[PDB]
Amino acid sequence: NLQDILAANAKWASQMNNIQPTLFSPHTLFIGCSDSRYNENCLGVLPGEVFTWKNVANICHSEDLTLKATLEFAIICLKVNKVIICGHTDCGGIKTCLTNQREALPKVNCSHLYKYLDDIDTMYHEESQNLIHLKTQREKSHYLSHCNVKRQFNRIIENPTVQTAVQNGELQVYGLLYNVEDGLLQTVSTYTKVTPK
Amino acid sequence: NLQDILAANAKWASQMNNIQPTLFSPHTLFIGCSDSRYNENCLGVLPGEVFTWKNVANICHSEDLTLKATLEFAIICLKVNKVIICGHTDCGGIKTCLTNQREALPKVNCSHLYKYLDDIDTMYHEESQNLIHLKTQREKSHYLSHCNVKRQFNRIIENPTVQTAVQNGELQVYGLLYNVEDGLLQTVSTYTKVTPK
Ligand SMILES: [Zn+2]
Ligand SMILES: [Zn+2]
């Protein structure tokens, strides 16, 4: 099966050499879920344009080293002019909390996934009094995916590296939601030099 | 900007829906560098097939919560049968250490990127005598890209979730190196049921 992968890669690479010879300086940092159904390509860019941080449920803890390190590198060293936090509908991590199945993770040897999803569960609990007005699971799941984009966006825009670059007119931050059913991006939040602060 | 991004996404989504409407569960966890020049699409397989953890210099600390959570979700919940750790040549984080410019990061308000890159710099220092015979930065950078694949691979295969699945013959782990000059994957390491670590 590795030989299948190497074969698939060689085919892909020969085609890629022909199509984009200049590929063989990004302007955007894309932060998205590890979910297999999308990546930075949903932005309608070519390779080389988008530097990507992809993690389970696109979680951006404010005091996390990887977040701070990634924002510093993208903004100060690579000099991206866009940071995009892009969640998506039908997110596994969110569903696991929404359907109260996080409790069951330690039983099946997923104690670290359990701990990792703490932030998502905390959001889900905070949101109980808003969820109750939505009738179907589809609606609740959509709401929490949207809500998670706001949640992580608000932490990114408090980051001092981000505030400095934005204030200087060198950076804009967008919070987007990818709809898996149609491939469309939807605007959740924006933070630019001119947005009210 | 955002207007351009939404238009490019809309156009992209239409082009995807016209070719493959049926695109709207993965077999592979891909772990790669945040680098803009490659992602899971280098494997040459269908979209929705590869769940992806993408971080700066593809660092996998054994005790990192994200590593454990990501492996537990992929192997136990998604039941992927392949874990791929895929580094690449011309890696910025490696070149920062190799060329001794990591020490410059605190001055430019990147002290967290500085701390994040400790593992890469430790590898660089550990390998310094091994690097003497290589007279060009290109050769050194290649050596260190390869070394880093094995370094992160070695930690992944010691994770209990990974070891259980591999010993059960339900998982294979591949260490790969993506050459940015030609789009081709080099095999660095493999771990299977019948292969020693
Ligand atoms: Zn998700
Ligand atoms: Zn890299």
Author numbering:
A (entry chain A), B (entry chain B): 17 to 40, 49 to 221
Provide passages from the article that reported this PDB entry.
Carbonic anhydrase (CA; EC 4.2.1.1) is a zinc containing enzyme which catalyzes a reversible reaction to form bicarbonate from carbon dioxide and water. The budding yeast Saccharomyces cerevisiae encodes a single copy of CA, termed Nce103 after the non-classical export pathway where it was identified for the first time. Nce103 is an efficient β-CA who shows high CO2 hydrase activity, with a kcat of 9.4 × 105 s-1 and kcat/Km of 9.8 × 107 M-1 s-1. Nce103 contains all conserved residues of the active site in the plant type β-CAs, and a relatively divergent N-terminal region.
